[PDB]
Design a binder for these strands. Structure first.
Lengths: 214, 190, 106, 373, 55, 179, 161, 42
RNA sequence: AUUGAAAUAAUAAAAGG
RNA sequence: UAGAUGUUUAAUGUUAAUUAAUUUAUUAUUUUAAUAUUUAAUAUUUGUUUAUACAAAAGUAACUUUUUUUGAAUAUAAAGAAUUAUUAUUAUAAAUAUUAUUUUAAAAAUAUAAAAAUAAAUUAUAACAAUCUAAAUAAAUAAUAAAUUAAAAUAAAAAUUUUAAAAAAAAUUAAAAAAUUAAAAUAGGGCAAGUCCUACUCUCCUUU
RNA sequence: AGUUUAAUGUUUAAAUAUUUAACUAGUGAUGGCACAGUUGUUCUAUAUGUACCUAUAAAAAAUAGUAAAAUUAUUUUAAUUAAAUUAAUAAAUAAUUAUUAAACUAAUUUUAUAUUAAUAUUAUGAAAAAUUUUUUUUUUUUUUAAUUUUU
RNA sequence: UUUAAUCAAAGUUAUUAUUAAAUAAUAUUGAUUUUGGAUGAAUUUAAUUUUUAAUUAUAUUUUUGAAUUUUAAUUUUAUUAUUUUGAUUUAAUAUUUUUAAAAUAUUAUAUAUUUUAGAUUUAAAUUUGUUGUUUUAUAUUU
């Protein structure tokens, strides 16, 4: 996929995807003059070329494409990023003890520091949209991420991470304030609120646990 | 070149600083707000190995390439253009009635690629073929003894059969239950 | 060395979820039946030339078998043997450069 | 050309290494209004010289006796010739403790022969071909392929090409009819005229650049390699493999000249870097060739001179791949001795007839002078 | 032959009906209300029921 | 020799099923096409595209009872100096201006007189005395000629005409720098 | 990096070979040598050869001296190579590098006085058969000359004493 | 020869330096009696 | 002057119709 | 635009003195040896039924544990036309074993094979009948510069014409015919020299 | 049922197969042994000697000195284009194109003009008579441009 | 459900190696297991010739019909060659390869650049009364 990730993906093709000089240059050669001066970079002599190149990711013009825009994917995706680039062995020694890990593990702490600044900068525009229909089970890990990356949770990203983090905080307390007087979510299939007691209690528990942290 | 000896650890990147063969970290020129900042090339690849592998597995398909189907590919293709677009309920049904081997090849593959999807959590009903291709495969060679001392080499061509079963919920199917009328003179005897 | 290297099925492009090789042994009844009954293949039990002659391997075959069993060379051991069970040794290079652990067997 | 009109530079700066252009008041790394492929300042290739080379002062050395340290004269009296520099060349010699003991004239014939490129080329062109493994340049021929002798098929009745005994260069087993065997090649000849003259114009360029430095002694106090590498740190010889390294013409001390090296230094002189060690002479043997007419047809080795120059002499390839030249004062005396009878025969008659007056021709054999050092 | 065939000419074979009426045709079928498998109208099972009455 | 096979290999993308695939057969084609564009451009493209224009300005002249056979001879008679592609631009975008021309060539209006040669002024012959102070008689007139032609061109408000308001004073701008 | 196609000039590699017929003959070393001229018989077939040996047959014993200019000598005694005090012989000339050793072949030399009219200082020379005026010049100057004609081993026993 | 094959596995003949020609071949005896070249060089 | 001959019936190579 | 009056390559190009974006100007139309097509929706394959003798050489893709003798030692199956192919490899012995491979639901030419007439077995007969589909499976062969064509008429070139030009209006597909296109400046007479031929008197180096 | 020939076969079941076509009646013969290439057998065919009698095998060079065929590199910077010819005692140059170099004056516009030397290169093919259409093979891109009328 | 029929293939694949060639002057009764086997002739390769011996010049001279030059220092080192550095340095470097990606112009017939028209010898060699001779090329990569 030329240009790599139009909006969603992290991958792209910049300065490491070369220019192959020995092949029949596929498309956008509107005119035959485009052999000695293809003059790509011009925006119209580029949309002709860039579109027919490595598939502008569409799975096949009717095949099933992935649902990456939704909070039900981005945030349990970001769970695996920091749960891998920072294994719990770093999380334990950071969360529990304040003592210095070591230079190596301090690099692995900063190696993943600027790995969040990547998956954020790429998939931030998506996070704000599905914030509307985002669910509390997923609005609750947004603070629980920047811990394993060891960052204090509270255009450029900083302007937009703030307003979003302020935006989510209210929507969490709304729901938590919507829980104390919770209507009947299911009078059928589960009219007895079981597993909803502890799981939503531990939410209210684990929500304020990060507040002092943040 | 030898990756076991010419590249001991691919996470590293050997340089020469002050005539010292030092091996720093390997990075990548990942993207930013408009800058290019280097991130760990082992970390940059742990995402893609997962964020992609975790992208596809949550796509309602079952991609399934069967290699080395014993048949020529030029003949296999012509009898896969029939199945293009057919729903799996009416592809296993129309491969089981045609006479050609290429359809017996698909049916056996369209069964192994059908139960495999069940363990993948896809329904057996709303399965519908999405992509089914034919690549040339490895070939054999019989000697072909001919007259007057001549000879040739009968090549026994095989092929590959790449197939992906998409899943569409709203796939409504034409009625095939409809018994004919002349058979509905089963009233006699019952 | 220029572009990232990920799982061989993700950026390469042909992403399958279950590859099946039919040339295996398990899938013999699946191929030996797919082909027609009219496709007779002779020499099912006996070959034509004499196979109890001794023969070499393919070029690529040795190349694989020389890297697996290199000690078959004369004097592959290390000329003085200084590593013994119970020694206190640390690794140097490669995977996990710098860990310390006592030898248990050599 | 001018294809690849896009996709070269990603349109963004790097993280902390890319700087935009402030303006014409500040200066970038590397910028210079002259085309320099090896750009060097006085920090990376610092010339070891009193002054800094310049168009004003003809050479970065003293041209007049500085009176705060004793003055030595050359061994043989100096007469100026065609390519000489026509000015005194007083060069401060150094000590193994990185000091400046005394100052000493330099013979303009050897060290003041103004360089010319159309002759130092002959020095390099000779080397780049002499310094060359010939025996590796061996390919098969048509008659070394071991194939059938008969035409591999009757040329007429067959639906093939008109070819017989296919062992030729067109085929993946044949070989060139006239291939490149070692003895076909050339070891070029090089006489004493154009070898000395070339070399003397290289020890001059090594002065005009300021990379020249006379040393009292090059002995290590012990034969180790530590005393070698420690001798370079104190005396300042960057000899790392990448940084420019020294060139060591070696001839022993001033009072004890010796054409061979010092076993202390020779054994410590071996270190995998930009160090060299050469014989303390610029002249070379007269070129002969015996197999000049392929008479000995059993020979291997190139045509031409069968008396090649040994690699450890002073050439033009290591005169520049090693930046600093490091001559010892013993080496100096031998240069002035062997080149003496050379500069005298290279004078006009009317001038060669004044030498017996000016004490140039005091014959150590007729007793008219005590024997020279 | 007198020459080689360009690809636009090997596809020319696939335009007419004699090619589509040999490869690219799908048969009408239906589940035998007893034999439970697909079937064409006319050809019957071996089961004594699928053979006495003719579904 | 040099087939220019580097350049002519990118072009193999926009050819039909055979030249696009096989590199050899594509070159013999793309080098046969490119060698006939340049053969048609420098040889035959003019004489054809140059007559689709002499047909459009002509057909646009029949709508006024005239034709190219007459228009061509009378666009020149009047010294009009219009390229035959310009008359097609007017006949298609400014239909009135074209018609306005077609009325001129049909009118009985005197064409502009041929440009004059170089006339010797009388003052060139007028015998000059031995006088060093005053200028030559011919320059005092030729210079006047140059400053009138200098003010007639454009409507330059020369500092809202701050320079000498009249000509006999503009020729005295050398006395402005005397004390 | 070009092909000197005769009658056509230098040509590029990869160029046109349609007009390089006689060039493919010269490279093969094949020499016709203008042999289509059967009609006109050259001087070769019609030239009576004198002297069953030849016009300048240098048979063994032929006394063919190598010419030594006299003016080359008088230039090397004032340049300073030759000491006019001593009887100048063939040994000095070789050692004074006045004349190379490729010049000296049996019998040694010959002193020729051409475009020389006077010799100011007396000179005493041992050469093989100086010319007449070369002799008179040296004799007229007080100096003398002798003709040291000797066998081969006389030359060697003298040049390498 | 590619890298190793029956045409190089075995060992046909090998070739050494070619002897020269007589240095003065081209002053053929047939001319040294017909002609005599005279005059100054050029 | 320095070998002399034979429809040497067939071949070959030429011309001519 | 652009040096010039047109046929002997440009290069410190990650300094063969470099080390993270070289994005390296690089390719021989044909004689090479490997692959890939096209002929190829193909030609040829296709296994439901016949009558059994022995040696040797011949092979040894090959196994054996199971009864060699009353000899000690030794050895007891298998081919050759390239093949699991037109085939009783037959020196010998023989006479009632059902003793274990042959697809297909069409039509023509052809190919084998077949009642009647101008004392014998024959004719010719290019006459009924009889055998030889297709599809399914499997797949080769020679051939291949490519076409933007190719119906049809019609003039133009040392020329023999591949083209081009005017004038036309020429649709796919399968099948079957071979009219045209893809295989030599030749056949026949009449003459004259030459080689072949015979023959020696005179010719040259024969050796035996 | 062993003996000199005719169709099919036409990469064919065969790198000579099946049927057609011309005479001799084993007390004398299927190989024993034997012969071999500037030559065997020879029932004398210059037939046959292991699927091309140029026998096969090996090693090699004179072997297209032969309308032989190939001969690897764009963007350039000097021209011509058929002309020459005497076998053989003392008479200025063969000619072509090519490479490399050289010199302006009795000799007019205040015009115009490729002469000379050295070396490389000699095969591009007429027989009758009569007689003393035209300039094109080769173009950097945009325009511009003067040779058209039917019987 | 309708598709009038057509129209396209661009630019990437794992996991294992240290072999060839030339060079080096220090070995040597034939490369691929245990003779005869009677105690005997099996297992014999010798002879004054450019030979596993390999030659520093251009002159003279045999018929100039092609031929062609002499110790270099006498037991002194141009010698027949590999090893406890993947032997050394240079030069060369490969399959098992098994890998593989997408709907723009037409729709009553003249060949790419999408304003719809116009424009067309396939090359090379061959042919110097044939530029237009009567050969060659399926394509790809080496």
């Amino acid at each position: 996929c030329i240009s790599g990730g139009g909006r969603g993906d992290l991958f792209t093709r910049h300065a490491s995807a070369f220019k192959p000089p020995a092949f029949g240059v596929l498309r956008g050669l509107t005119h035959s003059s485009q052999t000695t001066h293809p003059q790509t970079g011009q925006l119209r002599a580029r949309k002709l070329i860039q579109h027919a190149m490595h598939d502008r990711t569409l799975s096949g013009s009717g095949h099933h494409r992935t649902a990456v825009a939704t909070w039900s994917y981005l945030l349990p995706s970001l769970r695996q990023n920091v749960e891998q680039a920072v294994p719990d062995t770093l999380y334990e020694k950071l969360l529990t003890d304040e003592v210095p890990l070591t230079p190596a593990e301090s690099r692995q702490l900063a190696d993943a520091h600027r790995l969040l600044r990547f998956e954020l900068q790429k998939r931030i525009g998506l996070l704000e949209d599905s914030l509307a229909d985002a669910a509390l089970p997923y609005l609750l890990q947004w603070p629980a991420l920047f811990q394993r990356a060891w960052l204090r949770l509270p255009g450029a990203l900083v302007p937009r991470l703030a307003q979003l983090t302020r935006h989510v905080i209210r929507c969490v307390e709304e729901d938590l304030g919507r829980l104390e007087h919770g209507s009947e979510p299911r009078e059928d299939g589960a009219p007895r609120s079981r597993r909803q007691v502890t799981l939503e209690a531990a939410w209210r528990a684990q929500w304020a646990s990060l507040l002092s942290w943040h | 070149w030898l990756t076991k000896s010419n590249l001991p650890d691919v996470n590293r990147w050997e340089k020469v600083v002050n005539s010292q063969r030092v091996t720093e970290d390997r990075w990548a020129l990942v993207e930013e707000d408009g800058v290019m900042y280097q991130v760990n090339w082992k970390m940059y690849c742990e995402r893609l190995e997962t964020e992609l592998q975790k992208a596809q597995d949550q796509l309602p398909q079952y991609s399934f390439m069967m290699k080395a189907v014993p048949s020529a590919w030029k003949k296999l293709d012509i009898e896969l253009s029939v199945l293009r677009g057919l729903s799996v309920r009416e592809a296993m049904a129309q491969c089981k009635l045609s006479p050609r081997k290429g359809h017996m090849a698909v049916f056996r593959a369209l069964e192994v690629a059908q139960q495999g999807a069940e363990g993948k959590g896809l329904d057996k009903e709303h399965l519908r073929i999405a992509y089914i291709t034919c690549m040339p495969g490895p070939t054999d060679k019989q000697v072909d003894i001919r007259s007057r001392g001549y000879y040739a080499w009968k090549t026994k061509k095989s092929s590959h059969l790449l197939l992906t079963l998409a899943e569409d919920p709203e796939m409504v199917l034409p009625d095939r239950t409809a018994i004919p009328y002349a058979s509905l003179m089963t009233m006699k005897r019952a | 060395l220029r572009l990232p290297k990920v799982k061989p099925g993700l950026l390469k492009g042909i992403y399958t979820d279950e590859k099946i090789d039919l040339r295996d042994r398990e899938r013999l009844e699946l191929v030996e039946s797919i082909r027609h009954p009219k496709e007779r293949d002779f020499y099912q039990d006996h070959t034509y030339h004499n196979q109890w002659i001794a023969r070499d391997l393919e070029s690529h075959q040795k190349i694989q078998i020389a890297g697996r069993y290199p000690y078959f060379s004369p004097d592959y051991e290390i000329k003085p043997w200084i590593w013994y069970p119970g020694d206190t040794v640390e690794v140097v290079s490669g995977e996990g450069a710098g860990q310390r652990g006592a030898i248990i067997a050599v | 050309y001018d294809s690849r009109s896009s996709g070269v530079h990603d349109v963004a700066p790097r993280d902390g290494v890319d700087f935009m252009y402030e303006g014409p008041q500040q200066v970038l790394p590397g910028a210079h209004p002259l085309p320099l492929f090896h750009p060097d300042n006085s920090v990376t290739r610092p010339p070891v010289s009193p002054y800094l080379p310049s168009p004003q002062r003809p050479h970065p050395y003293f041209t007049t006796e500085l009176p705060e340290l004793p003055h030595f004269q050359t061994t043989r009296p100096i007469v100026y010739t065609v390519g000489t520099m026509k000015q005194r060349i007083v060069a401060p010699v150094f000590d193994l403790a990185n000091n400046v003991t005394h100052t000493r004239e330099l013979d303009p014939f050897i060290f003041g022969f103004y360089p010319e490129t159309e002759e130092m080329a002959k020095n390099l062109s000779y080397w780049l071909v002499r310094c060359q493994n010939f025996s590796s340049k061996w390919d098969y021929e048509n008659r070394e392929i071991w194939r059938k002798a008969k035409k591999n098929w009757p040329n007429t009745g067959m639906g093939m090409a008109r070819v017989g005994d296919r062992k030729n260069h067109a085929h993946p087993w044949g070989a060139h009819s006239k291939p490149v065997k070692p003895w076909n090649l050339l070891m070029p000849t090089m006489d004493v005229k154009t070898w000395s003259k070339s070399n003397r114009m290289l020890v001059t360029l090594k002065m005009l650049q300021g990379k020249l430095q006379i040393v009292e002694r090059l002995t290590l106090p012990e034969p180790t390699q530590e005393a070698y590498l420690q001798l370079c740190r104190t005396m300042g010889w960057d000899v790392r493999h990448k940084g420019g390294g020294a060139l060591f013409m070696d001839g022993g001390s001033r009072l004890t000249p010796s054409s061979e090296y010092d076993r202390a230094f020779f054994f410590g002189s071996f270190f995998n870097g930009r160090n060299k060690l050469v014989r303390p002479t610029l002249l070379c043997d007269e070129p002969y060739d015996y197999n000049r007419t392929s008479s000995k047809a059993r020979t291997k080795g190139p045509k031409g001179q069968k008396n090649p120059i040994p690699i450890n002499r002073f050439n033009a390839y290591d005169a520049l791949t090693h930046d600093t030249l490091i001559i010892t004062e013993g080496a100096l005396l031998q240069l002035e001795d062997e080149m003496y009878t050379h500069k005298l025969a290279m004078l006009p008659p009317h001038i060669r007839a004044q030498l017996p007056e000016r004490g140039f021709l005091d014959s150590e054999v007729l007793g008219d002078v005590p024997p020279a050092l | 032959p007198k020459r080689k065939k360009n690809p636009m000419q090997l596809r020319r074979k696939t335009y007419g009906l004699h090619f589509k009426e040999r490869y690219l045709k799908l048969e009408e079928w239906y589940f035998c209300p007893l034999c439970a498998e697909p079937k064409k109208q006319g050809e019957w099972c071996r089961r004594e029921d699928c053979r006495q009455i003719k579904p | 020799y040099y087939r220019a096979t580097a350049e002519l290999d990118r072009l193999r993308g926009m050819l039909r099923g055979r030249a696009r695939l096989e590199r050899k057969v594509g070159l013999k084609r793309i080098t046969f096409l490119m060698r006939t564009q340049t053969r048609y451009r420098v040889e035959q493209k003019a004489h054809w595209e140059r007559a689709i224009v002499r047909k459009n300005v002509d057909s646009a002249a029949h709508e006024h009872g005239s034709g190219w056979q007459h228009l061509r001879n009378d666009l020149a008679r009047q010294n009009l100096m219009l390229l035959p592609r310009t008359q097609q631009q007017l006949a298609q975008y400014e239909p009135l201006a074209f018609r306005a021309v077609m009325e001129l060539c049909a009118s009985r209006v005197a064409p502009p007189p041929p440009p004059m040669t170089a006339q010797v002024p009388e003052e060139a012959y007028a015998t000059r005395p031995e006088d060093p102070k005053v200028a030559h008689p011919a320059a005092r007139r030729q210079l006047e000629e140059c400053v009138e032609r200098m003010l007639c061109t454009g409507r330059s408000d020369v500092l809202q005409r701050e320079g000498p308001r009249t000509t006999q004073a503009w020729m005295d701008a050398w006395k402005e720098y005397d004390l | 990096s070009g092909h000197n196609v005769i009658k056509m000039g230098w040509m590029k590699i990869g160029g046109s070979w349609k007009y390089s017929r006689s060039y493919n003959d010269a490279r093969r070393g094949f020499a016709k040598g203008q042999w289509q001229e059967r009609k006109m018989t050259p001087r070769f077939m019609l030239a009576p050869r004198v002297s069953a040996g030849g016009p300048r047959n240098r048979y063994e014993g032929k006394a063919s001296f190598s010419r030594l200019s006299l003016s080359k000598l008088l230039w090397a005694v004032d340049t300073g190579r030759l000491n006019p005090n001593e009887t100048i012989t063939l040994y000095h000339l070789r050692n004074a590098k006045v004349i190379a050793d490729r010049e000296v072949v049996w019998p040694g030399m010959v002193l020729l006085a051409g475009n020389v009219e006077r010799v100011p200082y007396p000179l005493h020379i041992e050469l093989q058969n100086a010319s007449a005026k070369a002799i008179q010049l040296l004799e007229e100057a007080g100096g003398s000359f002798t003709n040291v004609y000797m066998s081969h081993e006389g030359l060697y026993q003298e040049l390498h004493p | 020869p590619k890298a190793g094959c029956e045409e190089i596995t075995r060992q046909g003949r090998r070739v050494v330096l070619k002897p020269q020609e007589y240095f003065a071949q081209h002053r053929m005896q047939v001319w040294q009696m017909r002609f005599k070249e005279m005059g100054p060089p050029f």
